[PDB]
Design a protein around this ligand. Structure first.
Ligand SMILES: *[C@@H]1O[C@H](CO)[C@@H](O[C@@H]2O[C@H](CO)[C@@H](O)[C@H](O)[C@H]2NC(C)=O)[C@H](O)[C@H]1NC(C)=O
Ligand code: NAG
Ligand code: NAG
Lengths: 99, 105
């Protein structure tokens, strides 16, 4: 008895097509980008995938923003703790705020 | 401006359009190496100036990131910051200094 809007839209000649790429393939693209970024920095975006430790990759980024890499190598635990707390703040904000 | 490391580009005309011939640099033949963040020497931590500490099966070298040009670890291309118990993954190796063969002469 509860007639939907979509049934009337289909019965009046309007049709919604499905997208070509499914959400599983979009998530696999996202997973490939994350795995490449984490395990190779930016080199996978400029040719072959070149492995590097993540602390040395972060030291390369720190030299990129104009800070000497000893600042990273003497504060690695504090930087990792700040990153973990920031990720927890993002997931709590996305759990709470819906706007 | 193309895929890779950009060097130049060349414009060309086209009917209702333009065509760019982007010139790019692409790394080709990678090789595996054993790396470390810092070098411990005489209770001092040596970090590379602009490069990476790599190693073959026996020795240690410092080289640039985008090409394999190994060189001897020297105080000219390294800087000192603190001591050896603050860096995770530090390895013991000697550091050459240029003044010592001039002194022992
Ligand atoms: C690793 O690097 C070292 C760098 O010293 C190489 O040792 C040299 O090998 C050549 C042979 O091609 C000798 O002529 C030199 O006298 C060696 N140097 C020293 C200080 O002994 C070594 O061959 C490289 N490879 C391996 C597998 O250890
Ligand atoms: C480096 O090591 C990995 C793991 O052992 C291996 O699969 C790879 O063929 C090696 N060589 C290169 C050039 O990556
Ligand atoms: C480096 O040398 C110091 C003193 O010579 C020693 O205490 C330390 O264990 C050495 N490092 C490693 C990894 O063995």
């Amino acid at each position: 008895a509860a007639r939907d809007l979509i049934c009337a839209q289909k019965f009046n000649g309007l049709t919604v097509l499905p997208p070509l790429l499914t959400d599983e393939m979009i998530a696999q693209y996202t997973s490939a980008l994350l795995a490449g970024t984490i395990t190779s920095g930016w080199t996978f975006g400029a040719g072959a995938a070149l492995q590097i430790p993540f602390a040395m990759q972060m030291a390369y980024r720190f030299n990129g923003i104009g800070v000497t890499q000893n600042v990273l190598y003497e504060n690695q635990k504090l930087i990792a703790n700040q990153f973990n707390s920031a990720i927890g703040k993002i997931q709590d904000s996305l759990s709470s705020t819906a706007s | 401006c193309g895929k890779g490391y950009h060097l130049m580009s060349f414009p060309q005309s086209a009917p209702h359009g333009v065509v760019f011939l982007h010139v790019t640099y692409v790394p080709a033949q990678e090789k595996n190496f054993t790396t470390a963040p810092a070098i411990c020497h005489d209770g001092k931590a040596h970090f590379p100036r602009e490069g990476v500490f790599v190693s073959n099966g026996t020795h240690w070298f410092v080289t640039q990131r985008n090409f394999y040009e190994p060189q001897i670890i020297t105080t000219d291309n390294t800087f000192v910051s603190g001591n050896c118990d603050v860096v995770i993954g530090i390895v013991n190796n000697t550091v050459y200094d240029p003044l010592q063969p001039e002194l022992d002469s």
